[PDB]
Specification:
Chain A: Keywords: Ribonucleoprotein, Ribosomal protein. This is part of a larger assembly, with chains A (about 150 residues), B (about 80 residues), C (about 140 residues) and D (about 130 residues). Chain B has about 80 residues and is an all-beta fold. Chain B is about 0% helix and about 15% strand. Chain B has one domain (about 1-75): N-terminal domain of TfIIb (Single Sheet). Chain C has one domain (about 1-145). Chain C has helices at about 10-20, 25-30, 35-40, 130-135, and strands at about 45-60, 65-75, 80-85, 100-105, 120-125, 130. Classes of the chains: A mainly alpha (about 150), B mainly beta (about 80), C alpha+beta (about 140), D alpha+beta (about 130). The structure holds four RNA strands.
Chain lengths: ~150, ~80, ~140, ~130
RNA sequence: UAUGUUCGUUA
RNA sequence: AAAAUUUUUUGUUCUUAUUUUGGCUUAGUUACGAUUAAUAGGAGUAGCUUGGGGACAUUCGUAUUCAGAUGUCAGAGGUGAAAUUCUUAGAUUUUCUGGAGACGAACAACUGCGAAAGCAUUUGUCUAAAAUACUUCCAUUAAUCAAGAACGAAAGUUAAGGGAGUGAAGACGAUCAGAUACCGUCGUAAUCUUAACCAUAAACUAUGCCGACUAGGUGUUGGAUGAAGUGCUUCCUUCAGUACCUUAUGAGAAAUCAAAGUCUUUGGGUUCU
RNA sequence: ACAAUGCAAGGUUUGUAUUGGAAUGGUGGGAAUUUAAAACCUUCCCAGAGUAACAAUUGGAGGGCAAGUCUGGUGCCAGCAGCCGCGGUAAUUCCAGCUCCAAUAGCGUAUAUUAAAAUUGUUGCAGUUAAAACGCUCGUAGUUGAAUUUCAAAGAAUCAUUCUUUUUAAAAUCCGAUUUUGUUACUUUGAGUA
RNA sequence: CUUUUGAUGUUAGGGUAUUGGCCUAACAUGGCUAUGACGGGUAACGGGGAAUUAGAGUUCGAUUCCGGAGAGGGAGCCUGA
């Protein structure tokens, strides 16, 4: 765990079966179209996979089609300029700052805001080390509120 | 002797060979005879195909399901 | 880990750590400070030549009871006043009040020796004649 | 962070051998640890080990024979020339008659004796005896 | 559950 | 689009064109082209999840005290014993009403939460975290870190407010040889709120952080799985906390320690001293 | 250095104060020689050793640390003593004599420095309580960093094993066969090293 | 820290035995630095080497050889390869 304590080994473990499940008679000629429709209707890939798993019974998009969901979402040009986790961290930091500008006495909120901003900077450095973010991306704390886009 | 261990199923997740405890199942509501796929440990509300009826309430685990229905494992 | 960096590219950290930490032991600091030159009266020399100013009996420590015979010596090299123990039984009488004397350390560098407090030097010869050849037997010529 | 997988493997081997449990599970397998284990095997210090090759950088189960006093890694992997092999040996190995210092060399993992007989010293991996 | 100090130095 | 070859118009020299190849644009063809998904990390989703995590607002409770009323009449406080103190102008005591500030008992635990300092009346709103479950997403994004930064009990400082109780100073009364102390009566600052400073504590488990391995049992906190007396209630397994007991042919100088072990059989990473 | 008696040990063997003859330098003189000349060295000839006066010293004898509970003196003085300590009448420690010990033509003392010192620790220290985990967290430099991409079989040779040789994808050279296929660290060999 | 007083570089030249901010003119604002710049100390000439070394190390090297610098302290200059 990056900050605080607690190992928290809670996670999801993929099955040994790396292939598409035998019982799935459905065809991958339209799974990508389904996720494309979901993304257009407006859904982040993290929860696109979840609604695909629950409401469509097609787990492991990587097994149904040989490609991962964010990859094919990019291949259709859908993917947003700011990735999942960076955007979620930005949103959380924005909410914290909005709370703080009203409650100046929330020292605990200030500490958590510093922690989440540190996480934002670490993740941003990684994502712009990859070409997944323009080299001038900075996360100005003044402009982050509208930066969500 | 850890290679031919056989009761690793009762073991915690990520045992000698990690393997999910969840699964998938089909549901047949008596008097409804509907065909649709369901995920064990489902996370959101789900509806039927033939006649819309609540099927399982999403909880921290294997859901509450309904008082009836014939639910069958999809394993092969 | 062991409290020290171990990586193959941590040599700088190990080197600075050792360099800083070797200032902590008395021996390295004593032998490497620039103070030592201006501190001791001998200015790093093993021996020194001085002029006897007076003779004084110095009290011994509490467990003992004696009157050690010492001489106050003005060094001619720099002019500092030191106190030199005079070894021997009747050796105080062998040294008059205005003689040139040769003194050396007392054997524990700049530390006091035995029950005699605050004395770090001892007379080895007065009027260019050894106290040793003057006292333990009169093999050598008497006082000039 | 585990840093060194081989260090974990060898510490686990040594601890299991000290308990005398005769069979041990090393979770993060790797090619380096496999070659180390099979060099130990070739020198006769362990029995038949078997890699459970799942889809997750699989595990290893090795059979012990109560035959190893100490197996350990040397971190960092100091680069050792042919000349100072003896200098490292006389400090590490418990005698100049048995025990092996494992070297990674341009020719693969090997012990000090055969690295000497084949020239081309390399980097130190670990030792066992 | 009122008050009640001190014992020169060395061996 | 250019070069290599040849022939060649043409009285010290002026055309040209021919075939092959290096580079541009164009249908089609390749096995055309992307490693896992870490008991690493981050993000997400879910739960009549958890919690004295934080902020703001709001509600309650006796007690204490002030004021008023009340009934009675000699003492009341306080101590080792007293005295200072209050007391016929009615003290203390009884009952009622109104105000005030602080605090939040009992429940309350070798319990919970938090990075630590710390956090306990109700309710609401805002905010965050952690654990668990996941066939959800990314795919090395990580560990520890000089400098630097946020927070940091109490006391203390500054400015307003508050000011009951306690009370560094101080003043008495005692005790004593003395008593500037311990004890008692009073009592200023402070303690509380807001806005700023300060940056220190035996800020302590005197034990840095991350990772792996090594053992039994009794508990307990929070999830999850499976099973059963009466839709309810208990047991089993498991994860994550949190303690305790025994054991060491483990360690240690010993006290002791399940980490302070896996160290002369000395090396997983890292910072500080 | 060596030989004979006394004495001691012991089954006519060793040590051991008297004698009393050999050997030899140190020394002086001459020479050969050496040397630019001379000197030294070397060699040869003369004398030249018994208290072989041709006379070894330095520092110690409580422990560390080898060697005195021997005799005088001083008597908490004088003094010794690196440290622990000794010294007030029995001083194994001072001042002396005798003896003994140690190193020896050498032996002490002072200062510095190395080992000792794993008491500077890379190898290789320690940090609950002996000195020592920053009050806590974040965090840059630095240090460190999961797994994954080409694996075996057959033969000749020491004793029962070990040791040496060949191939088995793909793309450009050679008409069933001829041959190159990231960068560095690192490691091996060289070159050039007064 | 350096940078008016050349600091970093460009262009042109002067000077030199030759390259060069070595110097001059114009121009630009560069150059070094927590991997320690700039400073301070050295009872510091450097190396070949010396002592002590089981291995690591620690300490020393004015002094046979090599390189440098100096001839009381500075500065300047003639002759000359």
């Amino acid at each position: 765990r990056m900050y605080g304590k607690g190992k928290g080994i809670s996670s999801s473990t993929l099955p040994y079966k790396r292939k598409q499940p035998s019982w799935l008679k459905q065809k991958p000629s339209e799974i990508e179209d389904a996720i494309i429709k979901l993304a257009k209707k407006g859904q982040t890939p993290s929860q696109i996979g979840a609604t695909l798993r629950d409401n469509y019974g097609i787990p492991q998009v990587k097994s149904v089609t040989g490609n991962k969901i964010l990859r094919i979402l990019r291949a259709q040009g859908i993917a947003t300029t700011i990735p999942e986790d960076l955007y979620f961290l930005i949103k959380k930091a924005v909410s914290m700052r909005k709370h703080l500008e009203k409650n100046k006495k929330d020292k605990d909120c200030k500490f958590r805001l510093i922690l989440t901003e540190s996480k934002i900077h670490r993740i941003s450095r990684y994502y712009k080390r990859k070409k997944l973010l323009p080299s001038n991306w900075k996360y100005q704390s003044s402009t982050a509120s509208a930066l969500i886009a | 002797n850890p290679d031919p261990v056989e009761e690793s199923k009762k073991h915690k997740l990520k045992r000698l060979i990690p393997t999910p405890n969840s699964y998938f199942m089909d549901v047949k509501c008596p008097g409804c005879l509907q065909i649709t796929t369901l995920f064990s440990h489902a996370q959101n509300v789900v509806l039927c195909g033939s006649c819309n009826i609540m099927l399982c309430q999403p909880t921290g685990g294997k859901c509450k399901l309904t008082e009836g229905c014939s639910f069958r494992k999809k394993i092969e | 880990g062991s409290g020290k960096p171990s990586g193959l590219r941590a040599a700088r950290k190990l080197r600075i750590r050792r360099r800083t930490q070797r200032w902590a032991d008395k021996s390295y600091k004593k032998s490497h400070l620039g103070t030592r030159w201006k501190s001791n009266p001998f200015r790093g020399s093993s021996h020194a030549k001085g002029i006897v100013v007076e003779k004084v009996a110095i009290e011994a420590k509490q467990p003992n009871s004696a009157y050690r015979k010492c001489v106050r010596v003005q060094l001619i090299k720099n002019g500092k006043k030191i106190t030199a123990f005079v070894p021997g039984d009747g050796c105080l009488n062998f040294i008059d009040e205005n003689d040139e004397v040769l003194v050396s350390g007392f054997g524990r560098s700049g530390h006091s020796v035995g029950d005699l407090p605050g004395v770090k030097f001892k007379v080895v010869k007065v009027a260019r004649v050894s106290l040793l050849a003057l006292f333990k037997e009169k093999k050598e010529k008497p006082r000039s | 962070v585990r840093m060194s997988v081989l260090a974990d493997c060898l510490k686990t081997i040594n601890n299991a051998e000290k308990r005398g449990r005769r069979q041990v599970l090393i979770r993060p397998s790797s090619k380096v640890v496999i070659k180390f284990l099979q060099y130990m095997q070739k020198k006769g210090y362990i029995g038949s080990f078997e890699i459970v090759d799942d889809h997750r950088s699989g595990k290893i189960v090795v059979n012990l024979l109560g035959r190893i006093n100490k197996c350990a890694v040397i971190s960092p992997r100091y680069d050792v020339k042919l000349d100072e092999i003896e200098k490292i040996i006389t400090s590490i190995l418990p005698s100049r008659l048995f025990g092996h210092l494992i070297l990674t060399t341009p020719y693969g993992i090997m012990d000090h004796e055969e690295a000497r007989r084949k020239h081309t010293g390399g980097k130190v991996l670990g030792f066992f005896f």
